[PDB]
Symmetry: D2
Subunit: 428 residues, 4 copies
Amino acid sequence: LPYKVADIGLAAWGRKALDIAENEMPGLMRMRERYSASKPLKGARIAGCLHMTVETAVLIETLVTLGAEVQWSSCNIFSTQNHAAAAIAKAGIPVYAWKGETDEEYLWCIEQTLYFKDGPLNMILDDGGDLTNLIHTKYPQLLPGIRGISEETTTGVHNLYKMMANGILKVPAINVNDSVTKSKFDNLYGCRESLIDGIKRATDVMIAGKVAVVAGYGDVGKGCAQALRGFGARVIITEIDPINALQAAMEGYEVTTMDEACQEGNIFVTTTGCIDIILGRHFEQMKDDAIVCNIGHFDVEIDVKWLNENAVEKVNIKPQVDRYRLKNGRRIILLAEGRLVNLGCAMGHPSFVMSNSFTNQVMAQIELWTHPDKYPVGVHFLPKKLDEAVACAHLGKLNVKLTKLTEKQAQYLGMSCDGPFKPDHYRY
Amino acid sequence: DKLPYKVADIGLAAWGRKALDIAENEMPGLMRMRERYSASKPLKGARIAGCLHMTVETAVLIETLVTLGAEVQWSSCNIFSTQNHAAAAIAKAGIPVYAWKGETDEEYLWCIEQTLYFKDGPLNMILDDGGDLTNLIHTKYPQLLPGIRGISEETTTGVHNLYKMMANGILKVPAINVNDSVTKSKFDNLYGCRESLIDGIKRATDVMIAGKVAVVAGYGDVGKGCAQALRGFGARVIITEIDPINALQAAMEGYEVTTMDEACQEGNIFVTTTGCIDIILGRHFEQMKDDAIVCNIGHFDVEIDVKWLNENAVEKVNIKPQVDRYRLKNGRRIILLAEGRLVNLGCAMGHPSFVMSNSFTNQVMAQIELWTHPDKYPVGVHFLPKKLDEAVACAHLGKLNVKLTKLTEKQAQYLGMSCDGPFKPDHYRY
Amino acid sequence: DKLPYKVADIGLAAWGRKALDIAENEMPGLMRMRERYSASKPLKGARIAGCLHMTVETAVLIETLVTLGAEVQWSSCNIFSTQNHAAAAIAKAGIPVYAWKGETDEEYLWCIEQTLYFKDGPLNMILDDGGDLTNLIHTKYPQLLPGIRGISEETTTGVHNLYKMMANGILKVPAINVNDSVTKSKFDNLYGCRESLIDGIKRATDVMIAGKVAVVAGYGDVGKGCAQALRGFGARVIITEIDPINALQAAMEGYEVTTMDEACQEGNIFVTTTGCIDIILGRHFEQMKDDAIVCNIGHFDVEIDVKWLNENAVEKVNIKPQVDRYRLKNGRRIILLAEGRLVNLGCAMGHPSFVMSNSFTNQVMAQIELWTHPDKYPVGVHFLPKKLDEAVACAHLGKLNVKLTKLTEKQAQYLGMSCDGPFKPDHYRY
Amino acid sequence: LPYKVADIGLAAWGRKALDIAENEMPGLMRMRERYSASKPLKGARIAGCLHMTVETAVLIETLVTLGAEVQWSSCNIFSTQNHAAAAIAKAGIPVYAWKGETDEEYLWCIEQTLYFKDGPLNMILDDGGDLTNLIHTKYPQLLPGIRGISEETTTGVHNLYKMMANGILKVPAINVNDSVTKSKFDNLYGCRESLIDGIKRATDVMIAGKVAVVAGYGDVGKGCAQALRGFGARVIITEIDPINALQAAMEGYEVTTMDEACQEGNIFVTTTGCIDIILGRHFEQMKDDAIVCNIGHFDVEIDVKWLNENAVEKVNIKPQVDRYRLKNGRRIILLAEGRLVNLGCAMGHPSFVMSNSFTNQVMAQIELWTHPDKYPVGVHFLPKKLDEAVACAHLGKLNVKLTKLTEKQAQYLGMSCDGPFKPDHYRY
Ligand SMILES: NC(=O)c1ccc[n+]([C@@H]2O[C@H](COP(=O)([O-])OP(=O)(O)OC[C@H]3O[C@@H](n4cnc5c(N)ncnc54)[C@H](O)[C@@H]3O)[C@@H](O)[C@H]2O)c1
Ligand SMILES: NC(=O)c1ccc[n+]([C@@H]2O[C@H](COP(=O)([O-])OP(=O)(O)OC[C@H]3O[C@@H](n4cnc5c(N)ncnc54)[C@H](O)[C@@H]3O)[C@@H](O)[C@H]2O)c1
Ligand SMILES: NC(=O)c1ccc[n+]([C@@H]2O[C@H](COP(=O)([O-])OP(=O)(O)OC[C@H]3O[C@@H](n4cnc5c(N)ncnc54)[C@H](O)[C@@H]3O)[C@@H](O)[C@H]2O)c1
Ligand SMILES: NC(=O)c1ccc[n+]([C@@H]2O[C@H](COP(=O)([O-])OP(=O)(O)OC[C@H]3O[C@@H](n4cnc5c(N)ncnc54)[C@H](O)[C@@H]3O)[C@@H](O)[C@H]2O)c1
Ligand SMILES: Nc1ncnc2c1ncn2[C@@H]1O[C@H](CO)[C@@H](O)[C@H]1O
Ligand SMILES: Nc1ncnc2c1ncn2[C@@H]1O[C@H](CO)[C@@H](O)[C@H]1O
Ligand SMILES: Nc1ncnc2c1ncn2[C@@H]1O[C@H](CO)[C@@H](O)[C@H]1O
Ligand SMILES: Nc1ncnc2c1ncn2[C@@H]1O[C@H](CO)[C@@H](O)[C@H]1O
């Protein structure tokens, strides 16, 4: 099996989108500009498990430009973009993903990505840690072969920390999420644009005048709240951390609990990465045609199982859009069956912010393969100078003119002018 | 002989019907209208030909006119703005509709003409958007004019035309400026666009707004929404304008305000909203950055010089329907959206149904006003009473769960004002 | 006999003069007016009595009327709104002014009366704010009316009164509604308040806005600015309103909109802007949170029941000038600002001079219009032409370095429009 | 000398302001509620060097409620609020500060605060580190007596890091600035309100329609930019860090250099904590009546010395407001003589956000005196649980209803429900 996709006839349209995407991802293009003739990743066979989209396609191709075999699966069962999976398949790269996978077909795709023509994998590129947990639970014999792993998302690094703690994480990993460039842009500015896209494409509902409830006010919650506020929704935040909770209050958001908010929320958006956020007792109290969705990583935040078993009727409006009628006569509109809505009902984050995440990922793959010394078995961060490098590579596109310290100023501040300008603990 | 309708695919009726049901729940203005008039059937004996974007929202409007006892026949007012499943639902209901997404300039005029004659005779009411149907009748069917009781016009361009026609003594039918109803011009035009513009752009291009420079030509009600929407997603918005007052507003709101001659060198994204010709020209295109996105959301596609692109470009690649990517002799590329047609309906579903409920409630009211009170309206261009305007707004407060304050008799008397009638003078600008 | 003036302290003249010089640099509208008319002296032979907040901005306005050849005598229109050093500068220039910060209701009426008679005879022009001077003359000096050529009225309350007077047939002098000039109502009322409200509150209390719940009564132009300003600093704004249209706007903008009966239990901060009586009552006060701040920014102090506080409170402690801290029987405390008078001028310097330049340019123009074109204006309530309105805006574009677009002859002809005359129809609401 | 103030007759008015302030500073009131009968600080003699204002008055009194002698000076020469310094003097607490100090009178005030009735000081409470650097340079014999120090502001902790690095910091210190509760509220939300207050009171200029230039886009720059944006200024950011620079670009701010910005800026606000930000060549290019000011800690960011020597004329408008005329005929309005404008031309930050900083400061003083073991000679942070405690103590006032994890959810997330909910590196 050379690959698996929904349609290879879409590869042509796919190639167009990539050419456009490339122009929006300077960070990744510098890497090609800089490491083409060098091929640092020479020898590496990188098994990837990220959302197979136009943005990821460009990432994959960049990894190859640096000289490395790559096999790919999708980490979510509806995130994949058919034409993007096609253009990568047509380029001679084993990709196993499509938009509409079942749970068995999802697990089946990750398996094809483990063995290459010249032996098993030696690098993981994961998000959420499905490919990490799989190789640790099903194929522990392949763990000594793997040299490094790089994790994209917040749930998958929290899981990589829980593994190192329980002494089961046998391979060294780099936390790419906690790069400032990822967490404080991707999670923040990314969802701020793609949440509403997902919701709009699915429902075409008016945001203005509505009351929107956002569970969680971390980086993702912040972006979602800001977005809905932008279109003149009234936003209500729920939260368990007093610091995050206070941040939201100081921004003019009412902060209460779901038990209260469910009685006035028109729109619901879980962003906690936690279970049991919206339950049946919430559903029973919601206004008619309340719109419920999730933008956390796993579909564990909404009790969809309750809606199935307790709804009077379930009308499907179109793919990833269900309209339940309840025994109280009012209806609930659920999106993407609880799975993340921005990739399930839209095209995910725009290419530019992904260039920031994926530029981090290239460096995270280079470091783990070019300097296997620095990184023992643990959970490490990328050095700030490299984190700043990613930011610097995107300034050009945005036409940003950056100031440079005089020698006198550098001496006053006691820092090297090229040198990272912030201490490690700096929170931006 | 004569077709019953013509649409993309009648199969999409079942799907459209679901959309209609959902939309109905978002459009209290039209539903109250139904609950209030379905028995009295005020529009009985009216034969209304409509030229308006055949969308899900318009479907709900059409079925409301029918419930009010009218006979309706519809065509879209833009070749790209029809939503096929919405047309299927209406067609399957038994309503003569002539609209599909992707019409030729030829087919578009054909579609309108299929509406002009009903089984019970010719049209006697006009529900127009942009003035296309108004102009068509006044020009190719002037003999039909005396049998038309009135016109209601939806958008700014259309009513401008009407006023011009009135000033040149060529308008022969009395008309109602529905656009300049407060519940239309200050909500539909402003808030509607504020949400639908971004959506049009996203669907078409999937581009990051944050960090982009955006150029909005025009700062009327439409431009205000667009600027607001763009800046919300982290773009630095630049504005162009000919009205010094509008210009002052934009500056006071923190927007840089300059000329297109200047902005074309800065913009990553360009949005025309002026309703005027020749806003973006070849000289502008030649200075734009690589992969600049260019789109219009004014009523007619006369604001961007597309024919220049076609003639002077060295490459033209269709990325997908209504998304073309040109390359110019300088090697930099220009993304055009919907062949210069309005991008919110061209590349997306237009305004959300809730704000359209305001637009369309005003429409229904104007149709009742013209049909049943002809004597109120002599040949001219008229506004709805402020009372009916305020009534529209009041109809949408419930769904948003707004709680309105009531004047005490003292408060009212102090203000010299009815507790229940225009809380504002005519010239009030909200 | 008759004093030349009366002000707090003539010593503050030197200081005020500096402020005047700075202000002049921020008010191009008035300066262009000077450069344009100082030689022609259009207002020669005019004897203008003014009742308007004696601030730095007004000083600049006064000296502009003098440069235009007029004889001016001034009193403030609010007992708390005068800025002493601004009054000193005017007094020292030789202009009869009667104003100081901290006037009694008695002294305030006295101050106005000192303006009614000039050395060269009685007043023949009125420049009023709120209608106090208009009503005074029509009531206690009706014999003076026939020798008055016209009136210009600055604020919403004042023009409402004028229209009422016109509808009851008791207005005997022709007047110009300056408030409903676009360059006033959409800038002064909106943007002016957006900056000066917060400043009034800060100076008075130095309280954190972020994290507070704020209740704004009224969502007209003034309320819109206040809501905007408060939400900007991280307050959750709640709105009350009687006009369903205004209410819809507020909701569409993301504000919760309910009744004062409800809000009084939530608010940390309360801001009245309705221009109506009895907005906040004892029943409201009794439910407010501890140390709730309460203030008004409408024209008259009739919106808050201060006398209730005085009579029913168990404690009253003056914290500092125009800041009183009550305690109620429930043990919770209420902070009142400026005895319920408008808080932006009461506890701060009012609007910044730049936006006031728009208000005051319209004023100067109205005075020239009434003085030199009486025949244009018969007894009634009139608007300035849109042309002059647009001219005001154009005068302030330069300082902000705005670059305005010019129509091509084709573009204009397409739009059926002068390149240089009202770019909008009358009913346009901007 | 029992104290030194501008007027003790203002103590009455001062007491009123405190009673009001107290109601806005719940965080500090809980500390009194909790440690009055306990007097943990019993034995401590705390020499303070913070801005002597209404907010600080409440802090001082809280420290005393916990049973500790306190002497106080002001760290800036125009920040002090007379009536607040009066109410503390009248309460029997040696305070040496007033609004209008000279440089010699400033140094003179810090000296009185060193020796108490029962011996020299044993605790520092500094900001900027003037009292820290003084005792290290002038009175090193008193260093062994001092048990702990707590630093408030960003410049004073960067200086405390430079001292520990050069092995000259002989006493253990707690970094209070880098508490999330301080840096991500005080610096951020505080200046967002008090910058414009300072500018308004000084000039009464219209913000709308103006172009404002903000040097720096850290926590302070972020607040200042957001504020000016709020009133419809067009804001331009200058910056040396690509990450901070990119953040500003993704928020819709034009990011260029001062060399460009000076030619269109109507208003100028330095927030870098760095020298030589605005020089004569910038001044020469500025528009007429450009308004220049600074909200960084030291008055080193603006070249006022240049304006004095090169201006044609210098008209004083009122205190802390100069209007220079230049040889090009255009004028510059300088505020507070370059010193920080929010405390020099207004009343500083509102009491509520200060309650967050000062609640941190109490815990920082308790920890250094109650548990002298945990903190050796270095630069330490407060533990996240205490940082979250500060946030929690303010939720009540704001009417925030916080969610609590179920046992099931806590187990899913693998965290204690009371337990800090974020990893150390979390950036909020
Ligand atoms: N859809 C996307 O494209 C996308 C992008 C980035 C991250 N994510 C996912 O989003 C989720 C969160 O990402 P984050 O970076 O926002 O994490 P984060 O930890 O910054 O914020 C999560 C917030 O949820 C709060 N929370 C936890 N349980 C809660 C509860 N029961 N009620 C209310 N609030 C609660 C936490 O206090 C925290 O502040 C993760 O699953 C992450 O993988 C998705
Ligand atoms: N796509 C939609 O859904 C939608 C919705 C509402 C209105 N519209 C259309 O949008 C257009 C404008 O709507 P509006 O309601 O904003 O009308 P409007 O007249 O308020 O806006 C016109 C603005 O354009 C400015 N303008 C005119 N010529 C200009 C030029 N050459 N350069 C710069 N600015 C110029 C005018 O001065 C004015 O400020 C009309 O064609 C109207 O039909 C479209
Ligand atoms: N302080 C200042 O510098 C300043 C500046 C401009 C105007 N004003 C004064 O402010 C007041 C309003 O100015 P505006 O221009 O906003 O006029 P406006 O008439 O647009 O605002 C009136 C708003 O108040 C609403 N309203 C009336 N009674 C109400 C009630 N009982 N409860 C709630 N809402 C109610 C009206 O429906 C309307 O929305 C007037 O007194 C005007 O003179 C003061
Ligand atoms: N006035 C107040 O009440 C108050 C409150 C908090 C902090 N501060 C002071 O403000 C200053 C900064 O505080 P911060 O917390 O904002 O620090 P911060 O480090 O978060 O942000 C400072 C920014 O300045 C940038 N910078 C440095 N040199 C620059 C240059 N030459 N040009 C442009 N940008 C440059 C840095 O990159 C950094 O992002 C310090 O002096 C601090 O003490 C004052
Ligand atoms: N368009 C996209 N392509 C690939 N990954 C994406 C896209 N949009 C969001 N993500 C990533 O999905 C993860 C959520 O599982 C986040 O780490 C986020 O960076
Ligand atoms: N979804 C929609 N259905 C019908 N008309 C619409 C829709 N969205 C915008 N419009 C109308 O399109 C016109 C622009 O040509 C405006 O008058 C506006 O009201
Ligand atoms: N600084 C000021 N000088 C004079 N009038 C002002 C000032 N600020 C606000 N006003 C006016 O006060 C009136 C409210 O009574 C409004 O008409 C407004 O224009
Ligand atoms: N009103 C105030 N009282 C005391 N300290 C303040 C006040 N406003 C700001 N600060 C502090 O001043 C420091 C700047 O030198 C910052 O650490 C900030 O927390």
